[PDB]
Amino acid sequence: NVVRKYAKRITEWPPFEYMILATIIANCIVLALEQHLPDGDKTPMSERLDDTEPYFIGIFCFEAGIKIIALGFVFHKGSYLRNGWNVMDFVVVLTGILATAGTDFDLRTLRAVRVLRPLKLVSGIPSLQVVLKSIMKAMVPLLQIGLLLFFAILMFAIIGLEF
Amino acid sequence: NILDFIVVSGALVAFAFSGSKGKDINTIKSLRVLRVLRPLKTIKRLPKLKAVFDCVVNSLKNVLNILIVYMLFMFIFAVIAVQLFKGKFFYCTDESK
Amino acid sequence: GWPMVLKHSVDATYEEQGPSPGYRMELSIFYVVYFVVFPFFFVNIFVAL
Amino acid sequence: PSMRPIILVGPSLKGYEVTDMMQKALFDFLKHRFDGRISITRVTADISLAEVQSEIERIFELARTLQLVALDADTINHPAQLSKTSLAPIIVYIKITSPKVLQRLIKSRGKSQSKHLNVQIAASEKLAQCPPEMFDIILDENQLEDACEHLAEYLEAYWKAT
Amino acid sequence: FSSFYFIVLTLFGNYTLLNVFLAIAVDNLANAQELTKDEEEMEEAANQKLALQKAKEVAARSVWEQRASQLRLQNL
Amino acid sequence: FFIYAIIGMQVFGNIALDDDTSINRHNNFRTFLQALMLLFRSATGEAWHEIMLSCLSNQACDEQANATECGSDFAYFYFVSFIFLCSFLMLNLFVAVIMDNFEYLTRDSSILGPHHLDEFIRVWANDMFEMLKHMSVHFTSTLMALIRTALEITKQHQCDAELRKEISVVWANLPQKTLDLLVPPHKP
Amino acid sequence: ITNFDNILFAILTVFQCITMEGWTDILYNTNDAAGNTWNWLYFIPLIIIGSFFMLNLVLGVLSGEFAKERERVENRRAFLKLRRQQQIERELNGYLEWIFKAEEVMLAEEDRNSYFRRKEKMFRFFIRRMVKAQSFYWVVLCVVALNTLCVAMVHYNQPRRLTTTLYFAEFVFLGLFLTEMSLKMYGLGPRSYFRSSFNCFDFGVIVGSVFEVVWAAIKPGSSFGISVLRALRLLRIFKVTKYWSSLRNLVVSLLNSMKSIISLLFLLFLFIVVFALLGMQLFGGQ
Ligand SMILES: CC(C)CCC[C@@H](C)[C@H]1CC[C@H]2[C@@H]3CC=C4C[C@@H](OC(=O)CCC(=O)O)CC[C@]4(C)[C@H]3CC[C@]12C
Ligand SMILES: CCCCCCCCCCCCCCCC
Ligand SMILES: CCCCCCCCCCCCCCCC
Ligand SMILES: CCCCCCCCCCCCCCCC
Ligand SMILES: CCCCCCCCCCCCCCCC
Ligand SMILES: CCCCCCCCCCCCCCCC
Ligand SMILES: CCCCCCCCCCCCCCCC
Ligand SMILES: CCCCCCCCCCCCCCCC
Ligand SMILES: [Ca+2]
């Protein structure tokens, strides 16, 4: 409740953050270590990489729980789901949890969101966040150029249909 | 004026070597290709075309400091590449040999 | 035609020998550094100047 | 006196190796550039409080020969410290306009005076609030040669004047 | 419908790349230009003041750069 | 493009077309228009090195041309210098266009410009109060007054004197009194 | 896949022509299906309007945004702080030269009247005055230039007399540059030797060259090509030219914002990694 909401704000002591960083790089290396074979074949080491997933999903869920109990959820106008980067972490962890539902259509499209886990490096290093904002600030004026390019492509595509 | 003179001289020497003998075709063809500087004459005549040419030359002289650095860096990369792949780009039409 | 040159560069065994696919595969870092420097950095340096 | 004697002051406290060495380099240039035209002497008695009076007459009889006289004082760290005495040398100001280069220089100049940095910077600043007209010549140059030629040119002007 | 991967990767990778590297080049080259300009202006300013004080005792621009000055004034 | 097309025609014009090479029925030097299309292809970077390698020395020469050996090792210089020069000249065109517009590209919404003038033209259709709410001797004096209120050059008499100085500096081409007549309307 | 059989196919092939990739093959296909007289009017305007004009607009908009952002309050503050640092360092260098001349004249005076201390210190001062003299600059540039000539002429199937000549010349040049570093470091003092970043470059390059020599002694086959980077010391010829300030301040700006550059080449790496893992998910093994 509220007696414990006071304590896990202290839990964000910097070694905890660097341990979350460490598990993020560990997950990135595990993802980069995979190899794909055509027709349902799989390598002898891909099984081990597939068994190492529950530790990662558990650590991410534990981190989300700490951030959800120490902070709010949506209510206090400052909380987990009211931060842009914390929403991406929530999507990643929630979808990883949902991928352990034992159905058919999940695996092909619910395993793909797992590639957004390297972006938790940006989500965990505020300097990278400000650098990313600097990058993306100069590409809002390019929206009109995007509309113009799409209009030119439409006109020339219509002409190509005609001829 | 040097360009005008070389154009005219090339034309005249090309006319002079017209012996219809076939002794040298590479030289006469080169003197023919030298005619292509002929439209380059109208840039000294038109003042605005000359102004555009001067602006281009000014930009080239503005980037001349970094062009030297660029060719030095690419020389270094070329020498590294020669140390790496010198003699190794040989092959057969038969992949097995 | 840079991917063809990259393929020849990686698939290069030794001096006066024919290729071998996938050999010397770590020689892509010569072509990743080169694009970082000349096509990406220096081109934009001239464009800015 | 017949001539106004040369006095160096302005970087920081005399007796400390920073000011001592800067003034000594300028002094050595002034010496061996004007060979046969300037007199060299070292002064250790406090003129600002005027044994004390035993040397002022010595200054006159060097200054009485229509020749430049160099005063290697060891206690002057202020132009107004001498303003009450009638000796009246030229107050040459070896000025450095930014205290940060002074502090980094004190760091650069060995290890001993690193602990003497604070008081020396404080007194340098104290001299810095002094008004420029109290001084005779300003040495704002950072290069040795530029400051040297500036002081030498003003010395040539004084030489031609008298 | 698997060509959206390549369309997105060639749109958001040929203009984000350009944005990043052109930002680097423009920022650093403009800093260099302003540094050389300012050090030269200070050099003649100091030289003129030094000549004035020493004699007293003994007795265009590019469009980018003009627009930069205008932006400086406006933001000031 | 003209110079390089003519050099290509007169040097690499009689290479025998071969659909297995880069001098084809599509990409030859045999006419001014085909050569110019080839140079436009090379400008956009479409396997221009392949064209160079198919334009080198010792190539099969066209049957109806008299020469037996056609193509030349001038292709290295030709193609490399074309890429360099075309890229440089098009960069200069790009930069000239950019700097011809640099006050628009660096525009601020708070600071005025031609947009305010066009919108005031729209105001033609009292409404001046509404536009003052909406902002960032009939339609010229008002324009001068609004420009004065936006950018600043008794202080009112000083502004009038500055307006007179500017009008004298920029007196129009063969006008009797165009800006001068505006000055009586621009004074207050 | 590249046809105009539909609005979506037409959009895809037009977009592919916009990127100037395979836009001629699509043109050369309409030159076979129909005549070749009128097809260029569809593609040359398309290329001009989509690839040249749009690149022009992107460059213009980006440069305008850069100009607007550069002259803000915090960016201007950072630039003025950098300028202040440069001015302070320049003045401090001048005053340090002042004090060094003072040291020299003093030490000469005490020697005009522990003995090995004085000997070694005057030797140090003589070296430090030598390594800054203009003739040392020119002799070092001559050695560097004669080094690049020995590496620019390595070619395939070179004569065996040349291979041994350059093999021994590499050792000679490594010895000469190690001697130059030793003299320079002893004269200026290690704390001051690394005050100039270009000396850090030279030290790192000669260390890498020694590492390459050792590694080639162990395994003759490989060659890291680090001994060539000594050609970058030819770049000092700009010192005696009126263009030292521009290039030096460019390098100063780069090294100052070398943290905002590494954290830009990293976000690019993160996005390339994300797209690599996405491509492995979608097309992996197929
Ligand atoms: C001197 C510093 C400023 C760098 C300047 C580099 C170039 C101006 C010079 C340096 C030595 C020259 C090279 C020395 C010898 C070679 C090998 C030579 O190959 C052959 O002799 C034919 C090959 C064979 O038949 O085996 C071709 C020219 C080349 C690259 C020369 C090209 C021009 C080079 C590179
Ligand atoms: C078996 C190991 C081979 C190593 C292959 C490395 C390939 C590198 C590709 C590009 C990665 C860095 C790009 C970042 C540029 C901003
Ligand atoms: C595994 C041995 C060879 C490694 C492949 C790359 C070697 C060269 C790396 C980059 C060297 C040039 C750096 C840029 C400075 C001009
Ligand atoms: C056997 C499967 C047949 C259908 C496959 C269609 C392609 C799958 C969707 C790919 C969409 C890529 C999205 C990338 C967004 C950045
Ligand atoms: C039939 C030609 C065989 C090779 C002869 C030409 C060799 C290369 C010539 C390059 C000329 C370039 C400079 C001329 C324009 C500045
Ligand atoms: C393969 C036999 C050798 C052929 C050499 C012919 C001369 C090559 C001309 C190169 C001209 C230099 C191009 C530089 C462009 C700026
Ligand atoms: C290989 C073809 C060469 C084509 C030459 C185009 C450019 C030539 C230089 C421009 C003319 C310069 C003359 C001097 C003007 C100051
Ligand atoms: C009989 C006609 C065969 C195909 C001709 C294609 C010509 C395409 C029409 C011209 C397209 C102009 C683009 C609009 C902007 C300049
Ligand atoms: Ca291509």
From Swiss-Prot, chain D:
| Tissues expressing the protein | Detected in heart ventricle (at protein level). Isoform 1 and isoform 3 are expressed in brain, heart, spleen, central nervous system and neuroblastoma cells. Isoform 2 is expressed in skeletal muscle.
Q: What is the effect of changing P89L?
A: In a colorectal cancer sample; somatic mutation
Could you name the domain of life of the organism this protein comes from? Eukaryota
Quote the function comment for this protein: Regulatory subunit of L-type calcium channels. Regulates the activity of L-type calcium channels that contain CACNA1A as pore-forming subunit. Regulates the activity of L-type calcium channels that contain CACNA1C as pore-forming subunit and increases the presence of the channel complex at the cell membrane. Required for functional expression L-type calcium channels that contain CACNA1D as pore-forming subunit. Regulates the activity of L-type calcium channels that contain CACNA1B as pore-forming subunit.
Record family assignment: Belongs to the calcium channel beta subunit family.
Known partners and oligomeric status: Regulatory subunit of L-type calcium channels that consist of a pore-forming alpha subunit and auxiliary beta, gamma and delta subunits. Interacts with CACNA1A, CACNA1B, CACNA1C and CACNA1S. Component of a calcium channel complex consisting of a pore-forming alpha subunit (CACNA1S) and the ancillary subunits CACNB1 or CACNB2, CACNG1 and CACNA2D1. Identified in a complex with CACNA1C. Identified in a complex with the L-type calcium channel subunits CACNA1C, CACNA2D1, CACNB1 and one of the gamma subunits (CACNG4, CACNG6, CACNG7, or CACNG8).
Q: What name appears for this protein in its UniProt entry?
A: Voltage-dependent L-type calcium channel subunit beta-1
Source organism per entry reads: Homo sapiens (Human)
- From the UniProt record, report the name of the gene that encodes this protein: CACNB1
Q: Which residues of the full protein are shown?
A: 227 to 412 of 598
UniProtKB/Swiss-Prot annotation, chain G:
Please give the start and end residues of each transmembrane region. Answer: 39-63, 135-153, 164-186, 197-218, 226-238, 257-282
Its post-translational modification remark reads: Phosphorylated in vitro by CaM-kinase II, PKA, PKC and CGPK.
Q: In which tissues is it expressed?
A: Isoform Alpha-1b-1 and isoform Alpha-1b-2 are expressed in the central nervous system, but not in skeletal muscle or aorta. Expressed in the cerebral white matter, cortex, hippocampus, basal ganglia, and cerebellum.
The function of this protein is:
Voltage-sensitive calcium channels (VSCC) mediate the entry of calcium ions into excitable cells and are also involved in a variety of calcium-dependent processes, including muscle contraction, hormone or neurotransmitter release, gene expression, cell motility, cell division and cell death. This alpha-1B subunit gives rise to N-type calcium currents. N-type calcium channels belong to the 'high-voltage activated' (HVA) group. They are involved in pain signaling. Calcium channels containing alpha-1B subunit may play a role in directed migration of immature neurons.
The annotated region (Binding to the beta subunit) lies at 86-103
Question: What family is reported?
Answer: Belongs to the calcium channel alpha-1 subunit (TC 1.A.1.11) family. CACNA1B subfamily.
Its gene is CACNA1B
> Which organism is this entry from?
Homo sapiens (Human)
Where does the entry annotate site (Calcium ion selectivity and permeability)? E21
II repeat spans: 120-286
Q: Where do the coiled-coil regions begin and end? A: none
Q: Which residues lie on this side of the membrane: Cytoplasmic?
A: 187-196, 239-256
Subunit structure, per the record?
A: Multisubunit complex consisting of alpha-1, alpha-2, beta and delta subunits in a 1:1:1:1 ratio. The channel activity is directed by the pore-forming and voltage-sensitive alpha-1 subunit. In many cases, this subunit is sufficient to generate voltage-sensitive calcium channel activity. The auxiliary subunits beta and alpha-2/delta linked by a disulfide bridge regulate the channel activity. Interacts with RIMS1. Interacts with FMR1 (via C-terminus); this interaction induces a decrease in the number of presynaptic functional CACNA1B channels at the cell surface.
Task: Kindly report every residue range on the membrane side named Extracellular.
Answer: 154-163, 219-225
Q: Can you name this protein?
A: Voltage-dependent N-type calcium channel subunit alpha-1B
Which residues are recorded as binding a 1,2-diacyl-sn-glycero-3-phospho-(1D-myo-inositol-4,5-bisphosphate)?
S196, R236, K239
